[PDB]
Structure 1
Amino acid sequence: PEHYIKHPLQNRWALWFFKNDKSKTWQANLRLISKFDTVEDFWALYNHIQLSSNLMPGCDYSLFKDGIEPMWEDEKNKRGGRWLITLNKQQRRSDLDRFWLETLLCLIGESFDDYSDDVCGAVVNVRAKGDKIAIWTTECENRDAVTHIGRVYKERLGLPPKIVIGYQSHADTATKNRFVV
C-alpha cells in the first residue's frame, strides 16, 4: 500500500496570505489560500506559490493548524506568543527562504516531540525594514513547552549559539521578551 497512498500528516494545515492594502482593515487583508493534510499535497502547494523572498513588501504567509486563524484573537492564540526571528535586509537573500521552509517542515513534521501540540502555526512577514519569521504557540505561561520549542527551533534553523532569539506574548505585542534561548 506504500505504493499508491499519499502520506497523511499528523495535522491538516491551512496556508494564508496577507497583502497590505491601506483601503482595508487588517483582518480584511488576510485570506485563506488552501488547505492540505498529506506530504504530497504540501509540496504541490509549496511548488506552486511564490518564494517569500519574491513577495512584495507588506505581504505575509501564515501556516496554521486547521481551525486556528493566524491572528491574536483566535481562542488558541489569545494566551500564547511567538518565537521571533528577525532578519536584516541582507538575510532576505541569504536565509529568508531556507528559514521559512525549515519552519514549514518543523510544523508539518511535528518536530517538537510532546510539545508539538502547543504549536499553532508560523508566520513570515516580508517587510522593507526587515523581515520576520515566527512560530506561534498556544500558551505563553507553559515555560516547559515554550523554551523547548524555542531550543529545538533555533537548532533546526542552524543559528549560532552566539545569537539569542526571544519569545513574546501576543498580549504584549498587541498593546519585551518573556523567554530567550
Structure 2
Amino acid sequence: GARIIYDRAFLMACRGGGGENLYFQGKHPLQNRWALWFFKNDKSKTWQANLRLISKFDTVEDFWALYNHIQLSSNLMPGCDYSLFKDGIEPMWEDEKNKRGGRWLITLNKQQRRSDLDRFWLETLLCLIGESFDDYSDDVCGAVVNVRAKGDKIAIWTTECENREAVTHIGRVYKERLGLPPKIVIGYQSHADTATKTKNRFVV
C-alpha cells in the first residue's frame, strides 16, 4: 500500500497500549524490517566477534519489547556502539548502501548523557521506524549511537551524500523532532570526509 508512517504519539501509545491493531493478531507492522547491532572494540577478540547482531524486528510492538529488554539488559559503557539499520544493510561504510553516504551528527556534552542521551536516541529510533522523512525515508540506512567519555554521539546515516533534497529534508525534520533550538546547528558529513577530517557539507 502506501508507506506505513507512524507519528511519535502513535508509537508512544503502542508501548503501553499496543497489540490492539485491527490485523496481524494486533501487531502494527513497520514499513521496514530493522536489525539492531552492538559493537565494542576489544583488542583481545577479532573484529568479527566484536560486532554482534542483537535482534531483528518489523512491528511497533516488537520494537518496544526489544527496547524494554535493552533498557533492562545491556551495557552502557564507554566504547559501546549500538546501530539500528534496515535489514540487509550492514552497519559499516563498506556496505554498498553506505559507501556513497554520510551522516547527520548530534554531539553531546557529558552533562547531556543524563539529561539528553536516552531521549535523543529514542527520538532517533522513532524517526527511523516511523518513516518520519516521508519519501526521503528511503535514503535512511540506519542510526548509530557511540558512547564515549569525551562526549557521546548520535547519527543518522543516509545512502547518498549527493542527494541534496533528501539529505537536507532528513536533517531539518530530525532537528525538529529532536526539539533542538534553532541556534544549535547540526551538520552532515560524507563518510569519505569523516575518514580524514559547523563547516560541514550541509548544516541546518
Instruction: Pick the TM interval, shorter chain.
Output: over 0.9
Shift of the alpha carbon at 1:173?
Answer: 1.3
What is the CA distance between 1:31 and its match in structure 2?
1.0
- 1:158-173 equivalences in 2 (<5 Å): 158-173=179-194
Say which is worse superposed, 32-41 or 16-25, in terms of deviation. Answer: 16-25
1:180 paired to 2:196: no
Relative to structure 1, the CA distance from residue 52 to residue 91 in structure 2 (aligned partners, 3 Å threshold; closer, same or farther) is farther
CA gap 1:123/1:44 in 2 versus in 1, 3 angstroms: same
Superposed structure 1 runs of 4+ greater than 6 Å apart? 51-54
TM-score (structure 2 length as normaliser): 0.83
Q: 1:150 to 1:144 in 2, by over 3 A?
A: same
Return the alpha-carbon distance in structure 1 between the equivalents of residues 76 and 47 of structure 2. Answer: 18
Post-superposition Cα deviations, 1:75-111, rounded to whole Å, max 9, x if no partner, equal 0000000000000111001100000000000000000
Q: Distance in 1 between matches of 2:72 and 2:104?
A: 21
Deviation of the 1:23 alpha carbon: 2.2
- Contact kept? 1:83, 1:165, Cα under 8 Å: yes
**Matched-pair contact (CA < 8 Å) for 1:14–1:66:** yes
Query: Secondary structure of the equivalent of 1:21?
Result: coil
Deviation at 1:172, TM superposition (A): 1.2
Give the Cα–Cα distance (whole angstroms) in 2 for the partners of residues 70 and 25 of structure 1.
17
The structure-2 alpha-carbon separation of the partners of 1:179 and 1:87, relative to structure 1 and needing over 3 Å to count, comes to: same
Residues 158/98 of structure 1: CA separation in 2 closer, same or farther (3 Å cut): same
- Contact 1:124–1:132 at 8 Å: present in 2 too? yes
Cα 1:53–1:131 change in 2 (3 A) is: farther
- DSSP-derived class of the 1:56 partner: coil
TM-superposed deviation, 1:20 = 2.5
Deviation at 1:27, TM superposition (A): 5.0
- What CA distance in whole angstroms lies between the structure 2 residues aligned with 1:91 and 1:15? 23
Cα deviation for residue 72 of structure 1 reads 0.4
Structure-2 residue corresponding to 1:101:
122
Answer 1 or 2: which has greater helix percent: 2
Q: Deviations over 1:101-141 (max 9, x none)?
A: 00000000000011000000000000001000000000000
Q: Pairwise CA RMSD of aligned residues? A: 2.2
TM-score, normalisation: structure 1: 0.93
Stretch of structure 1 that moved more, 66-75 or 44-53: 44-53
Q: Partners in 2 of 1:176 and 1:135 — Cα distance?
A: 18
Greater Cα radius of gyration, structure 1 or 2: 2
Alpha-carbon distance between aligned partners in 2 of 1:9 and 1:59, rounded to the nearest angstrom: 27
Label 1:81 to 1:153 Cα distance change in 2 as closer, same or farther (>3 A). same
Assess if the C-alpha contact under 8 Å between 1:83 and 1:135 holds in 2.
Answer: yes
Aligned pairs (5 A) from 1:1-181? 4-50=25-71, 55-174=76-195, 177-181=200-204
Comparing 42-51 with 131-140, greater Cα deviation is found at 42-51
Over 3 Å counting, the alpha-carbon distance change for 1:114 and 1:151 in structure 2 is same
Structure 1 unpaired stretches of 5+: none
